[PDB]
Structures are given as C-alpha cells and as structure tokens.
C-alpha cells in the first residue's frame, strides 16, 4: 500500500 497525505491535491 501507499502513503499519500490526505490534503495532497491528487489523494
């Protein structure tokens, strides 16, 4: 799985 910030534009 991958961890991308919840506020990143392309979450």
């Amino acid at each position: 799985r991958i961890h991308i910030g919840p506020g990143r534009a392309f979450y």
Partner: antibody
Amino acid sequence: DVQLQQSGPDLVKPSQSLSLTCTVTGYSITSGYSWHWIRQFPGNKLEWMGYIHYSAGTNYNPSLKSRISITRDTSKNQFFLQLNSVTTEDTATYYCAREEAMPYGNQAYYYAMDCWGQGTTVTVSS
Amino acid sequence: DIVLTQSPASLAVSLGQRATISCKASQGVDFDGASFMNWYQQKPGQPPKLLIFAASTLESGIPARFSGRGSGTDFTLNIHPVEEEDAATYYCQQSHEDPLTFGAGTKLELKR
C-alpha cells in the same frame, strides 16, 4: 541514477516572464509520481512553488497561483516553470525535484522529494 | 497552511556531542498509519538532501548517527555523535497536504 538539471536565464527584468527548464536524465518523467519546482531565497527560506503530477494535472502554491504555470515535454524529458510579472522579490535560487515512492514500514511506500537538481540562481533587476 | 517552527534557529555543538533539533507543526501531520514529516540537510552551495522521511525512516546511505522521532505535531532530529561533516542547515518539511511547507531551518555550527 536519476539526475535533474535546471537551465534558463540568470537575469530577468521586472514585470517580464521567467522561464526555466528542468532536464531529467536516467529516468523518464512519465514514471515519476510528481515533478516539483521549489525556490530558495537569500536567508535560506525554502518556498515550494508547485508540481505536475503523473496524470499531467498540476497544483500550485496559492501565493503563486495567479502567475505560475508548469508544463512537461514527454519527448525531451523535461518539465518547465513559467512565472509571470516577476518583481525583484522573485530573485532566488530555483530547484526542480522528483517526488518518488520510498520503501516504508512493512512492504508499504511513502512519497517524498528525493532527488533535486543543482539549482539555478535567477536575479530580477532592471 | 501548515506552519513548521524549528527550534533553535542556530545550534553550536562540539564534535562527538549530541545535537537535538525540534520541529513543531501548526496542526497534526499524522494520517492512516504515517506521520508526514521529512527532514532535509543542506550544505552551502548544495541542494537539500533528503535525510529522513515519514518521521523516522533513514534514506539509503545516511548513517545511523541520524535518528528522527515524533508524531502528531512534535518532531525531533537527533545527531549523535556530531561529526565535522554535519555542520549544515537542517529543515523539516510536511507532506500532509498541499501546499507543501518547510520550516525556516536550524543551522548546526561547530563550537570553538
């Protein structure tokens, strides 16, 4: 390994447009998660400017949104920064950077800007 | 915007000593199993180099003298023992949301 290199004019006059190029070697731009432009001001303050995502969609810093544009060229493997109506306040060192998936925890991945260019100094003055 | 505050702004240390640099976020940077706080090191005339990501993970090639810890809003970078080559400016950076922001930086200088 991957290498990024910024190029563009080192001197721009006020109210004109600044255009920089980031050439990527050893890695194609279509493979990276996102490609960023960050600038560093004298005094060392780093301000993130924006990025072009793999989908080709872009996101910009709200402070620069009205005058910034980021595009990419899949063939020449380059991405670009266009900043309009520059003022002397835009004098800074400009860097491009890659955001890539790093190994994290137990077979997981975490995105981080891991490779930055050498940087290019731009002075805005009349 | 998430504002990152580093402390102190400058730190003078002797070789072999322990250095601790703090980074405080204006709002939590934790989410679904990860703390989105990374650290960069920058030597004069060089671009920032990624040191630690996700709060405590060392990037490949970085020596174990560097350790990161923290969660929520409070993070710390520790260097022990401090070496000559460690004199540099260190920045914390949050990836919890856009815009991505950096702290102002802590300059690690050598004591004499």
